[PDB]
Amino acid sequence: DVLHPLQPRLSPRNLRVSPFHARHKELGAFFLEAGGWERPYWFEANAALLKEMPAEWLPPARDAWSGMFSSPIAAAEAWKTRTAVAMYDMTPLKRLEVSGPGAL
Amino acid sequence: STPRIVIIGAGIVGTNLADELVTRGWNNITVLDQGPLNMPGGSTSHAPGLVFQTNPSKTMASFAKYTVEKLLSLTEDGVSCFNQVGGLEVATTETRLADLKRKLGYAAAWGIEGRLLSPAECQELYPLLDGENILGGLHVPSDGLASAARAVQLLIKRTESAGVTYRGSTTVTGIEQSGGRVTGVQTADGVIPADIVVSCAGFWGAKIGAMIGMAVPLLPLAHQYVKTTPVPAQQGRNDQPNGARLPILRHQDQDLYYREHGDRYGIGSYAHRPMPVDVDTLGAYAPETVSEHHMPSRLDFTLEDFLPAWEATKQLLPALADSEIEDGFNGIFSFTPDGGPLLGESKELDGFYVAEAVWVTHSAGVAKAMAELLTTGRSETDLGECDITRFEDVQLTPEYVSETSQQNFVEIYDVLHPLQPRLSPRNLRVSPFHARHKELGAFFLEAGGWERPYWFEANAALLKEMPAEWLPPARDAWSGMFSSPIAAAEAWKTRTAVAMYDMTPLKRLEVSGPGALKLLQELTTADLAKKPGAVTYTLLLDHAGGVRSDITVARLSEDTFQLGANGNIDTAYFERAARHQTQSGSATDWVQVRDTTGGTCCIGLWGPLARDLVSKVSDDDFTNDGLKYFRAKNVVIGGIPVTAMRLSYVGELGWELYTSADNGQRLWDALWQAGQPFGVIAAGRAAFSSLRLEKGYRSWGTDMTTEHDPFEAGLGFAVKMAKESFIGKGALEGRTEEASARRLRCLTIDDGRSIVLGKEPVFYKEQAVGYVTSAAYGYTVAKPIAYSYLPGTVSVGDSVDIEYFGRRITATVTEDPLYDPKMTRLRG
Amino acid sequence: DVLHPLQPRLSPRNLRVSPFHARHKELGAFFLEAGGWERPYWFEANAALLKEMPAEWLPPARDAWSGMFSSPIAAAEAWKTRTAVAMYDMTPLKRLEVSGPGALKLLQELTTADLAKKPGAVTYTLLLDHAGGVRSDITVARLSEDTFQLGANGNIDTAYFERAARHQTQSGSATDWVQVRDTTGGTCCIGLWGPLARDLVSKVSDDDFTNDGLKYFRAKNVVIGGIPVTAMRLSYVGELGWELYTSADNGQRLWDALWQAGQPFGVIAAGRAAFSSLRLEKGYRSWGTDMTTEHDPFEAGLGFAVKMAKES
Numbered sequence A: 001d002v003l004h005p006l007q008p009r010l011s012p013r014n015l016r017v018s019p020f021h022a023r024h025k026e027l028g029a030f031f032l033e034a035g036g037w038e039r040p041y042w043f044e045a046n047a048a049l050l051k052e053m054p055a056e057w058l059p060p061a062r063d064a065w066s067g068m069f070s071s072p073i074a075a076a077e078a079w080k081t082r083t084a085v086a087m088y089d090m091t092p093l094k095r096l097e098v099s100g101p102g103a104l
Numbered sequence B: 001s002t003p004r005i006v007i008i009g010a011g012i013v014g015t016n017l018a019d020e021l022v023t024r025g026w027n028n029i030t031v032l033d034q035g036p037l038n039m040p041g042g043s044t045s046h047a048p049g050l051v052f053q054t055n056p057s058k059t060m061a062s063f064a065k066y067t068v069e070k071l072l073s074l075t076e077d078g079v080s081c082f083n084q085v086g087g088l089e090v091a092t093t094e095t096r097l098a099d100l101k102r103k104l105g106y107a108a109a110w111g112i113e114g115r116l117l118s119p120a121e122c123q124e125l126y127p128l129l130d131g132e133n134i135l136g137g138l139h140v141p142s143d144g145l146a147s148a149a150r151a152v153q154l155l156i157k158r159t160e161s162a163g164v165t166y167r168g169s170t171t172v173t174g175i176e177q178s179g180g181r182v183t184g185v186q187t188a189d190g191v192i193p194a195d196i197v198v199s200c201a202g203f204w205g206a207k208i209g210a211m212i213g214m215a216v217p218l219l220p221l222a223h224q225y226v227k228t229t230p231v232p233a234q235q236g237r238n239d240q241p242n243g244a245r246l247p248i249l250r251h252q253d254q255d256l257y258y259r260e261h262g263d264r265y266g267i268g269s270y271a272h273r274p275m276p277v278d279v280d281t282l283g284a285y286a287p288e289t290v291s292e293h294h295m296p297s298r299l300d301f302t303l304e305d306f307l308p309a310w311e312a313t314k315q316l317l318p319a320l321a322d323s324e325i326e327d328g329f330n331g332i333f334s335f336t337p338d339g340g341p342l343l344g345e346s347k348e349l350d351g352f353y354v355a356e357a358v359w360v361t362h363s364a365g366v367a368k369a370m371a372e373l374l375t376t377g378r379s380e381t382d383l384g385e386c387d388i389t390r391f392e393d394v395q396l397t398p399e400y401v402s403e404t405s406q407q408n409f410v411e412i413y414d415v416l417h418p419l420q421p422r423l424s425p426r427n428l429r430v431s432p433f434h435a436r437h438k439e440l441g442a443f444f445l446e447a448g449g450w451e452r453p454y455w456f457e458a459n460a461a462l463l464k465e466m467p468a469e470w471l472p473p474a475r476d477a478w479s480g481m482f483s484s485p486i487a488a489a490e491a492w493k494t495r496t497a498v499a500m501y502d503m504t505p506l507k508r509l510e511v512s513g514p515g516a517l518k519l520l521q522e523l524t525t526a527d528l529a530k531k532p533g534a535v536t537y538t539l540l541l542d543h544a545g546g547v548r549s550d551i552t553v554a555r556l557s558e559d560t561f562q563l564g565a566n567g568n569i570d571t572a573y574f575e576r577a578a579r580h581q582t583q584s585g586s587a588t589d590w591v592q593v594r595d596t597t598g599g600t601c602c603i604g605l606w607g608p609l610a611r612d613l614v615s616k617v618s619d620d621d622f623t624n625d626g627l628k629y630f631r632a633k634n635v636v637i638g639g640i641p642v643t644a645m646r647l648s649y650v651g652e653l654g655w656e657l658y659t660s661a662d663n664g665q666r667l668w669d670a671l672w673q674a675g676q677p678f679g680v681i682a683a684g685r686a687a688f689s690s691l692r693l694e695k696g697y698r699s700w701g702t703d704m705t706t707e708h709d710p711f712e713a714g715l716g717f718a719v720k721m722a723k724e725s726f727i728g729k730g731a732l733e734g735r736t737e738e739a740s741a742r743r744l745r746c747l748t749i750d751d752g753r754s755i756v757l758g759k760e761p762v763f764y765k766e767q768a769v770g771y772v773t774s775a776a777y778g779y780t781v782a783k784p785i786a787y788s789y790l791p792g793t794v795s796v797g798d799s800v801d802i803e804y805f806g807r808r809i810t811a812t813v814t815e816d817p818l819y820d821p822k823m824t825r826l827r828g
Numbered sequence C: 001d002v003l004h005p006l007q008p009r010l011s012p013r014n015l016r017v018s019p020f021h022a023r024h025k026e027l028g029a030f031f032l033e034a035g036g037w038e039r040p041y042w043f044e045a046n047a048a049l050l051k052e053m054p055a056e057w058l059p060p061a062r063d064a065w066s067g068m069f070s071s072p073i074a075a076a077e078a079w080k081t082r083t084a085v086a087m088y089d090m091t092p093l094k095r096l097e098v099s100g101p102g103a104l105k106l107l108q109e110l111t112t113a114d115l116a117k118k119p120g121a122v123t124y125t126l127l128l129d130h131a132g133g134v135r136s137d138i139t140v141a142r143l144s145e146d147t148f149q150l151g152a153n154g155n156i157d158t159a160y161f162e163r164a165a166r167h168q169t170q171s172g173s174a175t176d177w178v179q180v181r182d183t184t185g186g187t188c189c190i191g192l193w194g195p196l197a198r199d200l201v202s203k204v205s206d207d208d209f210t211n212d213g214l215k216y217f218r219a220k221n222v223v224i225g226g227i228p229v230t231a232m233r234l235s236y237v238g239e240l241g242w243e244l245y246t247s248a249d250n251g252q253r254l255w256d257a258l259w260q261a262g263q264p265f266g267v268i269a270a271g272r273a274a275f276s277s278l279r280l281e282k283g284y285r286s287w288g289t290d291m292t293t294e295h296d297p298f299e300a301g302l303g304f305a306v307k308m309a310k311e312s
């Protein structure tokens, strides 16, 4: 099959979720998956900000291919990260604890 | 014998309307304008006049073709009001290039000649284009340039000769009414009497509407237009000062369009922030002061907004880098929430009509349709996308009009898929099941303000267990937009198990009172004098026999009927008809109409396990003996009082289950829990639309409009010609399905994979003879389906080609319904 | 069994819910039921406010009996209604639409008010029986020439109006017909009350909610958060603000718009326990307990609501 590089599986899904998962679903998270983790790519709650975003932040139209698994909402999320404050879910970042008298 | 008519506005719409009324024999018309007659000063007085006929809308394309024809004919001293230079849309992106192939399909569908041009051919036609940029073009030789201001003057001249009165320098300040009908138009100098008032006031249309408490959903917005200094490359090529020889030019990838003005260029730009205008700040212009650069429609030019457009222009047309900006202005026009115009009779006031938010391109077509409407009671062209009554109440608020009209301006020249939703405002109207739908991962799209699931992500888990025969082929990127393979699983479970569809958004009208039966007997094509409990599928026709709507009528009691309808055009039609019957009738003829959609809800519970499911949560009898096909009765399900109607838009066993909004979530939860051992699912609109197509069930507004009679549409069965009286009966005398010159036909796509979406042209023996009305992938039949009208001589079993993005797809005319023609799933 | 007067059934429950039900569950509503409707008595979300509440608002301990189906959270909800702004779910208030060319005539005969007032008037008035006993106290809002919206006390009122309407229709002229519809289940209502109510609503509407824009005991149509609303200026809790009515399909959006607008003002959801306390502090009577048909309006202290100058 011809598949886009971000094409997710439809099953199995929701294997691993962060502690924020219910709040992310309230906010309309669009999830894609890696390593079993459900990861928001953007949040539909933030679509409401596009109308208030300065025009300099609004991107050009995308083609059908680059537009797959993409949303203009991402521009608003970048805008607010650069000008306000944002909460990103870094839970899936591989986290190792190295301990003991030989750790150093 | 002719009504007294006042037209408000001597723009291109109002003057064309006077003219179209005159030729139909109605000349008792007074046209009013606050501006001077020689240059009224609305948008028409600044329009550059580009007319591109090709349009996704059949109606809009027809309006444009008529405007071209009419303006060519409108002449004086040997010079018409149309310079037929042709039109060229260029593509600088691959996305745009593909969309031009789609637009070539619209052209063929709507009977407009055009061709796709290669980069070399674009150079030959338009050598000023820098070719490095150009991937291809769409050339329509019959497009061109309107002389709109000249047309207004020549229309005034010939209608005056025929007896029409014009009063320029005359400001309407109010509208006089009595008994729910218009009686006159108020000015500073008194009232002008009128039986009919048509508001052709352009971007002042909302201000006029407020005079009668009518919401007119247009927003005045400004758009930049610039004229260059003389362009060196153009020296000596065109007649001064305003000639043109090259096709009008669209550069949609940069939100720009162009025409020649002698050796200067005119540049129209939508490449700027939306610019809403407050009409109450424009100031009253003394008519003696109105001139080319000083009129209400022209605001001061804001050069800073134009700089990026100027750069893009020099990149497309390098010759223009050797000119400068000579003059610009920010010119006011109108936009609406869906980009359609606003036509028809007001809800608030009988005899008061609108014809507003109309491009010069469509002006004569809108005027002709309105003249037909006024003098006969119907337009010859389908107004479903144009009628002011199409809007729901949440779509009429100033905030909604402002937001959505601004976004339509921002997207004016974008390539968009037919199912593309707005991202805001959203979640305005939701059914009682909304929280449960979100738990199930609903993918929502919106219409009329309602959030409607197209499929549910919960059902993705079923794909792995689905029999391979149900799994569809891959879709292309375009047909795959706003689509999911999950829809195949939802169709599978509807056909083999049981599913819950949210039918809440189906327009729901309650018609009640001692005159309810009488009203419905006159308006529909069914004999509705049946004991309570009968459900009837029936049509509303106009006096010419055209199909206004297909509806279901359920008689709930002697004086109460519940209708399932197609939208707010139906609501307004019933409201006025009910009021007229009440006003002119006896004590036993009164009838009220209520749109109860937002206060109620409906689950379509369909599939072969529907009786097994419902039996667990009700003690009412849902066997065939307990509730026969196309009957309704009151039941209790999960403790909730429900009106159950036995019919199915998806062609399976089961019922529409109606209840009040406060009870909906409980009804949902009870059926949900009962359905667990039967594998119940929630199912969305994508599966629903596919399944209804597999049944051959028609969708009003695409599969039939007022342009079609019931026999052409294959709905003869729904017309009871033996009835004594009903609207349209006389027109339909003698007509049959078999003798219809055009007939709605079912097409299946031979290759099993090439899905079409709607509006693609259909060819028989290489001639364009129809266009796709409705389409879907049929999951049960495992092939794409498309409907199209075809000449009566084309038969079942014949082959036709449907053109999709420039490629011909072979299809076969096939008997419908495609699924279960013996109705085994529905009966007994 | 020994049962407390507020003891709910545990089943069947969740039969009728307002459009705000999911938002109420997010906020930890404690629901009790009446007439099938699930009604929040307080919200667990507001327990977090108790630590910031001025001590003068904190009540004494309750005994086990008076403490049943009660919570100190109700004190915080009353506090915020009196000092900030609160959203009460008035959806279950019996709502009747009385319409037709005979609607005014019907209401003129059945109530104690002169209702022949231009549309927009809201009137508190009584329904009496022929002995002068109080059948009900209602609000009547004239929405148009031939349409009235009534706030009533229950289905005894609905049946009383239904029969009276039918009798007037049957015995009357072409201009005397009148229909009565119980629209409660198809609509919803937020009571938006408290001294910051105008500050809140001003953020999500361009309609004028000043005194000049909407006078006490008047109604007008407005748009809030994109939703068409009928706003009535009165308050069962005795504070500034309005009853905001709309169709059920629009309710969640109306709720969410006001909620978001109210964040900088400390808006809360407030339940029936605070509501009942606040209305008592106002002396507002509750039909069926504070007065029945055994009482006349004067005994009940509702003389002000009877227009003895009316012809009939």
Ligand SMILES: *Cc1cc2c(cc1C)nc1c(=O)[nH]c(=O)nc-1n2C[C@H](O)[C@H](O)[C@H](O)COP(=O)(O)OP(=O)(O)OC[C@H]1O[C@@H](n2cnc3c(N)ncnc32)[C@H](O)[C@@H]1O
Residues within 6 Å of the ligand: B008, B009, B010, B011, B012, B013, B014, B032, B033, B034, B035, B040, B041, B042, B043, B044, B045, B046, B047, B048, B049, B050, B051, B170, B171, B172, B173, B200, B201, B202, B203, B204, B223, B224, B225, B268, B330, B331, B332, B333, B334, B355, B356, B357, B358, B359, B360, B361, B362
């Ligand atoms: C502004 C603009 C518009 C435009 C365009 C470029 C610019 C910058 N380019 C176009 C294009 O190339 N192709 C095309 O098809 N259209 C283009 N347009 C749009 C076009 O100009 C408008 O859509 C069209 O002209 C609208 O015509 P309409 O006849 O509907 O409106 P109008 O010319 O504005 O006339 C309305 C008249 O109503 C009178 N009026 C308003 N209120 C009153 C009151 N109260 N009393 C009396 N008269 C009233 C106005 O004075 C006006 O003359």
Ligand SMILES: Nc1nc(=O)c2nc(CNc3ccc(C(=O)N[C@@H](CCC(=O)O)C(=O)O)cc3)cnc2[nH]1
Residues within 6 Å of the ligand: B506, B535, B537, B550, B551, B552, B564, B629, B630, B647, B648, B649, B650, B656, B697, B698, B717
């Ligand atoms: N809500 C809803 N609206 C519709 O428009 C609708 N239309 C159809 C498709 N049209 C119809 C129309 C007629 C019959 C039909 O079988 N009529 C029969 C039965 C009438 C009867 O037994 O009383 C006929 O003999 O005319 C079935 C589907 C199916 N479900 C719908 N459901």
Ligand SMILES: Nc1nc(=O)c2nc(CNc3ccc(C(=O)N[C@@H](CCC(=O)O)C(=O)O)cc3)cnc2[nH]1
Residues within 6 Å of the ligand: C093, C122, C124, C137, C138, C139, C151, C216, C217, C234, C235, C236, C237, C243, C284, C285, C304
């Ligand atoms: N929905 C609802 N129903 C009620 O029964 C109700 N009752 C009260 C308590 N009773 C009332 C009754 C009258 C006035 C009142 O001030 N009437 C004045 C004002 C009338 C006017 O200005 O038009 C009067 O002068 O009679 C206030 C509260 C408050 N809110 C309610 N809200």
Ligand code: NA
Residues within 6 Å of the ligand: B255, B270, B271, B409, B410, B411, B412, B413, B414
């Ligand atoms: Na744009």
